[PDB]
Design an enzyme around this catalytic site. Structure first.
Site, PDB file in Angstrom:
ATOM      1  N   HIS E  39       0.809  -1.214   0.000  1.00  0.00           N
ATOM      2  CA  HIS E  39       0.000   0.000   0.000  1.00  0.00           C
ATOM      3  C   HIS E  39       0.845   1.268   0.000  1.00  0.00           C
ATOM      4  CE1 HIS E  39       0.869  -0.615   4.287  1.00  0.00           C
ATOM      5  NE2 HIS E  39       0.681   0.683   4.431  1.00  0.00           N
ATOM      6  N   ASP E  61      -0.966  -7.303   1.355  1.00  0.00           N
ATOM      7  CA  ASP E  61      -0.546  -5.955   0.978  1.00  0.00           C
ATOM      8  C   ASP E  61       0.946  -5.764   1.235  1.00  0.00           C
ATOM      9  OD1 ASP E  61      -3.135  -4.948   0.102  1.00  0.00           O
ATOM     10  OD2 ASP E  61      -3.694  -4.937   2.225  1.00  0.00           O
ATOM     11  N   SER E 113       4.391   2.587   8.600  1.00  0.00           N
ATOM     12  CA  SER E 113       4.325   1.217   8.103  1.00  0.00           C
ATOM     13  C   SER E 113       5.710   0.708   7.724  1.00  0.00           C
ATOM     14  CB  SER E 113       3.390   1.138   6.897  1.00  0.00           C
ATOM     15  OG  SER E 113       2.062   1.474   7.253  1.00  0.00           O
TER      16      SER E 113
END
Lengths: 52, 162, 162, 162, 162
Positions: E39, E61, E113
């Site tokens: 992502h 992802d 992330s």
């Protein structure tokens, strides 16, 4: 067909004039920092103008 | 005074127009809606404000957009009382005379478009869009609004987009 | 000042609107007749005043009722002189500017409806009915009356019933 | 010396080639006209200079463009006197021997293309375009010009585009 | 401890994912092969590593790619021993309980992330991909691997991509 073409040209010219008038009217209808422009719309009434 | 003017401009949410890492102008929020000079390309330095769709006004080379009310909480305060004298802005003072704003030469250049002009009370009286060399001084092309709400743009002959 | 404002509000007969033991609002007597915000449910904290039958006004979400003359003896004093500046009310000060009342954020919430706004002389100038989050401040939805006796309600867009 | 070399390179208008915020090379103005290595993509870090249209020269993987005379005012000074010895450039010294320029290993990498080579007088003698690992040193691929005006490109066998 | 964790993360080759000059995430090399959250858009902050072609895994992802053995020399050490207790990561500590990782509120946001979770020995036990507001704390969405080599992704209901 000649008459139809002349009428179409006339309609297009009228539309262009209306669009230019709307642009000219929106020129004072820019931000004009107040976030409130009732009175220009109430006076000019170019189109879609003052609710009151 | 200039210190307080810069502090007020920074505390109020103002963001330069960044393009490829270069400051090409400035944009500010007055009266609760964002304005941007149309000739300046790039995006406002605020992701939240960048989400707002702007409308174009070719006649004045300016853009405008609606700001959320919660963000309308703290914007510039405009006033129509514009007497003759001197005002303050980011690059110092500005002289107002004969209905025109003038600053000493060497003040202002390409990339300064969008800087507002503040009074002694910190209220906006005009927005600087450009200028033109005027010998010992330079005359700025600005837009000002009367007490009747009429937008008037003063543009010197052969003014350069600064 | 706030002390004197609270003393004047308490000495003048004012009573919150009690429902199931919870304060859901406030009501006061101005000009010798009781007023109550219609959206607030419950009964006035006064058995004698509760005996008065109220009339509804949906347009402003307000109610009114006749107060006995003997109880009209001591009510709020209203004035129409509303210059720009700052006023006082139960939860502190209020800023009046551009015809709108604004207070710092975190002041006012659900259940404060009915609190009047007082001037330096202790005269009522507006009644607070609600509000809406305005960033660093909040804008209150109020009703005010001009010297001609016209009732004007100022309601911010998407104002919440506070 | 290196301090003075960097000061001269900075005072003279030199601008790296920016692409997506990354420095992929450098470009400079010598003899009053801009040159750029063709293999390096991006635009010069100067809006005024970026307005100039460049011409391509595949044979040397170099580009060139005309610079306005007013901006030709202050450019690099070229000389043809290239005796053996040591010269200076942005990342230190360079050894010139047998007609080839060599620098110690670990000096120079991808993105350094465009750095000129200066003599003791600050005059340009060569332009660094690439290099190849040469053990304890590395040999740079450069272009130099004789007193007769002949462009000669020295490229080591299997030289890498640095 | 946090100092040592940051030192280990920096000494080991780890590089944020840069896009238009903004840090939108982080990526690291564990077990000798690079992983990247799918992502997150952009390129790794390493030209040598950027040369590696990645493969996509929509289900989690996440992306992965082969790292040259010479660069596999020094990567993260993974372990399957994940007892209950507290672990350490870039933004402080993390509580592990009931098979879920939780951190105090205000820790972690969009752009974090890719940050791994380390044990007392500096071994990776999980990779942080997102999170969701959990009152006084926040619960992170992570992937962990058992001693049998099964990839298990724990995702709280309505978890936000952080």
């Amino acid at each position: 067909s000649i008459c139809a073409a002349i009428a179409t040209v006339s309609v297009a010219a009228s539309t262009w004039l209306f669009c230019r008038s709307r642009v000219a009217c929106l020129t004072p209808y820019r931000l004009t920092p107040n976030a409130r422009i009732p009175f220009c719309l109430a006076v000019l009434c170019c189109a879609r103008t003052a609710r009151a | 005074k200039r210190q307080r003017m810069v502090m007020k401009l920074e505390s109020d949410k103002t963001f330069p127009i960044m393009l490829e890492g270069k400051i090409n102008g400035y944009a500010c929020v007055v009266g609760g809606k964002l304005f941007r000079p149309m000739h300046v390309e790039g995006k406002i330095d605020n992701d939240v404000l960048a989400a707002l769709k702007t409308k174009k006004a070719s006649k004045y080379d300016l853009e405008y957009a609606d700001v959320p009310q919660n963000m309308r909480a703290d914007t510039f305060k405009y006033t129509h009382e514009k007497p003759q004298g001197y005002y303050s802005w980011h690059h110092g003072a500005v002289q107002y005379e004969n209905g025109r704003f003038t600053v000493p030469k060497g003040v202002g250049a390409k990339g300064d478009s969008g800087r507002p002009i503040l009074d002694n009370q910190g209220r906006v009286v005009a927005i600087v869009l450009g200028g033109v060399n005027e010998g010992s001084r330079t005359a700025l092309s600005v837009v000002m609004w009367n007490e009747k709400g009429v937008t008037v743009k003063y543009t010197p002959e052969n003014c350069e987009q600064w």
